[PDB]
């Protein structure tokens, strides 16, 4: 099904103004963002969601700064970007679930502090 060039974990420090959690699908065949549905999970909660069919991003209030670059979706890039204030109290394992046309897969990335 869907494949990723997965990463074990990413680290950020005090110098990190914003953090970026990587998520790259290697075998995407979607030609339109309307065929893509991306959901980022943290501790069993949808902390980010991209509805391709409705072209809208959805975030809870504790992840107000969480967003992805939509223009990079069709290239397989579904990396999540947020500010340090939202990442400080949210260290742990993030799940990047990507729904692409007929196929669906997910990968787990860990966000740790140093």
């Amino acid at each position, epitope marked *: 099904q869907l494949l990723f060039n997965k990463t074990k974990s990413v680290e950020f420090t005090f110098g990190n103004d914003t953090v970026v959690i990587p998520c790259f699908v290697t075998n995407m065949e979607a030609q339109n963002t309307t065929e893509v549905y991306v959901k980022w999970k943290f501790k069993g909660r949808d902390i980010y*969601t991209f509805d391709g069919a409705l072209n809208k991003s959805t975030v809870p209030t504790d992840f107000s700064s969480a967003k992805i670059e939509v223009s990079q979706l069709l290239k397989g890039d579904a990396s999540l970007k947020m500010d340090k204030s939202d990442a400080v109290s949210h260290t742990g394992n993030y799940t990047c679930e990507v729904t692409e046309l*007929t196929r669906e897969g997910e990968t787990i990335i860990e966000l740790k502090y140093r």
Partner: antibody
Amino acid sequence: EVQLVQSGAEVKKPGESLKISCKGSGYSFTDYWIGWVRQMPGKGLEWMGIIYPGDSDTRYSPSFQGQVTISADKSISTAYLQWSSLKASDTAVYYCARVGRFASHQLDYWGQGTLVTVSS
Amino acid sequence: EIVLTQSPATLSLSPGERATLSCRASQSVNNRLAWYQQKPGQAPRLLIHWASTRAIGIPARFSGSGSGTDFTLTISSLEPEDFAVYYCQQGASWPFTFGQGTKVEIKR
């Protein structure tokens, strides 16, 4: 638990205005799309439109655009379906429902429905 | 608009037999299809989403299959509490649409 309670049955006359409501509870109301479905007597389901209570982003079906107004109030977690001039053909059962956060946009939870009767 | 056509209009089957409900679309919806059941005087009830994925609390007798245009809802063993109207719904493209509906009546 997730619950969607709609307003009671309405009996109106043609040309009158009407505003039916749907209050959600047991979940974050501002983070899920709310859809309105019309079911005329002995007929199938009709998707009227959806609204995202977070920013009041409203999407209408082409058959209902300009014929009805959909709004929401974050302060009391309530979605609204409003007419400015009712017709006899508006006589139907109206359901509010929560759109699941999935690619299929299915409706996992439904209201009890609001029976609207319009005649002279 | 993506038109959803269900077939047949009415299925007359005996309790215990299996039911095969079809749902055709004007174009590809890519598994983004949902199934519902509706009993008289009651709101629709979610059965299947993502074409094949069963919902929480849904009996195993209900099954979903198909991708793109042709889709199918399957009921292995018909129970007395299964004879009702069934709808199909697509969520790939806005406006989201329902099917005409298929009624399953008891055959005697």
